[PDB]
């Protein structure tokens, strides 16, 4: 069975998530409205920008993260943000209609829509594949929140400094996850390994996005549709 | 009576305006919705950003402007944009309710609202005064469009180079305006001088905005609400 410190980690993460994720998606009406040349760009840019702020909020509450140098914090956020976005978005994803259901017709996001935001079907495909596979793991809220913190504390991120301390923090988290599945998750002998796998699939998805985004980013008529936060997090200014 | 060249200028300006100004304000639903900490900021930032693009569009069609160096064009836009914004906004201003009426409750803009976008009443007052006074001049569409082009081609703008050619273009425009009022505007012996006056009131309003904006601009939690175009036009990068 788990220890006191590990259990205090589970609480903190679960609380952080609840505090930064609304299952009713009521804030989406404050974004520039969706429109089905990259007519979805304005809306999705806002959805992503909103989410960064949320990932930041969650991150600030990951035990150990607050103590990292401002630079490393920034370094981890910049390189993992999009991955954390994809992970948390799974909660709104539906195997039923292969889309992120956040509202009526307006906030239901089809693969098609992400295209009207400058993204091809070729790379939109692996995202759905990742979403579907991840959904099938029927993760407990405690595992979903752990995986996000693991992802965030990957020492292998361009720009990181104290990669030894990042490495250590991530390992402490990886422990709690393995222990938790062992004790609390009936029927999950492979789960862990499966979850670790997901982290690598995210890396590809990340790299892929970087390319797509770079292109978009360089055309001023498009970058003018993005928000300051997006431009900053995905920007390449050292 | 007017000449052929002067009359060709009137047409071009009137057409440019019609092409860049919608009296139905139907595009406002694409902006982030208004909300009555600077809750109106997101919406107004979008309203202003939209307008810059429109002022650019109009500018590109001012006879003579297209031939200026890219730098001078940029220099004139950066320093006059806000002034042109205030001028064209007069069309939506209503002496009846002292507000810019662009839609139902949502798009009706009260002095109060601009406050929820980081602007004090002290300086919001002179704007209304300017709007009211300008409205009372019952300008013809031909005079309103001329005044905007005059304003835009003021040689006295920080950053301008060929101020002699700017000076000349503005004078050609000032001619057409004086001639037009003489020939076509029954009862306007003072009008011209009154209009030229307005240009100076704009200068103050401009300077005032610059200060307000600078403050806002420097607080990241606020500038993150603005758009790339606004940040660029009002930014101070040489």
């Amino acid at each position: 069975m788990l220890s006191d410190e590990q259990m205090q980690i589970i609480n903190s993460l679960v609380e952080a998530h609840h505090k930064t994720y609304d299952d009713s998606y009521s804030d989406f009406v404050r974004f520039r409205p969706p429109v089905r040349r990259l007519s979805m760009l304005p809306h999705l840019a806002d959805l992503v920008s909103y989410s960064i702020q949320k990932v930041i909020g969650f991150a600030k509450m990951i035990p150990g993260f607050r103590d990292l140098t401002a630079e490393d914090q920034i370094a981890l956020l910049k390189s993992s943000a999009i991955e954390i976005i994809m992970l948390r978005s799974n909660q709104s994803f539906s195997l039923e209609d292969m889309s992120w259901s956040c509202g009526g017709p307006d906030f239901k996001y089809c693969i098609n829509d992400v295209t009207k935001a400058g993204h091809t079907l070729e790379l939109l495909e692996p995202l759905v594949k990742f979403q579907v596979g991840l959904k099938k793991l029927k993760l407990h809220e405690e595992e979903h929140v752990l995986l996000m913190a693991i992802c965030l504390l990957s020492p292998d991120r361009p720009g990181v400094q104290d990669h030894v301390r990042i490495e250590a923090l991530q390992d402490r988290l990886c422990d709690v996850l393995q222990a938790y599945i062992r004790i609390q998750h009936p029927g999950g002998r492979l789960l862990y390994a499966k979850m670790i796998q997901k982290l690598a699939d995210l890396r590809s998805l990340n790299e892929e996005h970087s390319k797509q985004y770079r292109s978009l980013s360089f055309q001023p008529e498009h970058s003018m549709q993005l928000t300051p936060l997006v431009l900053e997090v995905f920007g390449s200014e050292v | 009576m007017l000449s052929d060249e002067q009359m060709q200028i009137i047409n071009s300006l009137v057409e440019a305006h019609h092409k860049t100004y919608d009296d139905s304000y139907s595009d406002f639903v694409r902006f982030r919705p208004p909300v009555r900490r600077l809750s109106m900021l997101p919406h107004l930032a979008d309203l202003v950003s939209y307008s810059i693009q429109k002022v650019i569009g109009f500018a590109k069609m001012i006879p003579g402007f297209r031939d200026l160096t890219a730098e001078d064009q940029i220099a004139l836009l950066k320093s006059s944009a806000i002034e042109i914004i205030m001028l064209r906004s007069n069309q939506s201003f209503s002496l009846e309710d002292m507000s810019w009426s662009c839609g139902g409750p949502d798009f009706k803009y009260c002095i109060n609202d601009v406050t929820k976008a980081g602007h004090t009443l002290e300086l919001l007052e002179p704007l209304v005064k300017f709007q009211v006074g300008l409205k009372k001049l019952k300008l013809h569409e031909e005079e309103h469009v001329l005044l905007m082009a005059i304003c835009l081609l003021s040689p006295d703008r920080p950053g301008v180079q060929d101020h002699v050619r700017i000076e000349a273009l503005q004078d050609r425009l000032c001619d057409v305006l004086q001639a037009y009022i003489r020939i076509q505007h029954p009862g306007g012996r003072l009008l011209y001088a009154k209009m030229i006056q307005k240009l100076a009131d704009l200068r103050s309003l401009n300077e005032e905005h610059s200060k307000q904006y600078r403050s806002l601009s420097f607080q990241p939690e606020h500038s993150m609400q603005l758009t790339p175009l606004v940040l660029e036009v009002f930014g101070s990068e040489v």
Partner: peptide
Amino acid sequence: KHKILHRLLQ
């Protein structure tokens, strides 16, 4: 740069 992130990180 990174003015926004620095601020959001408190």
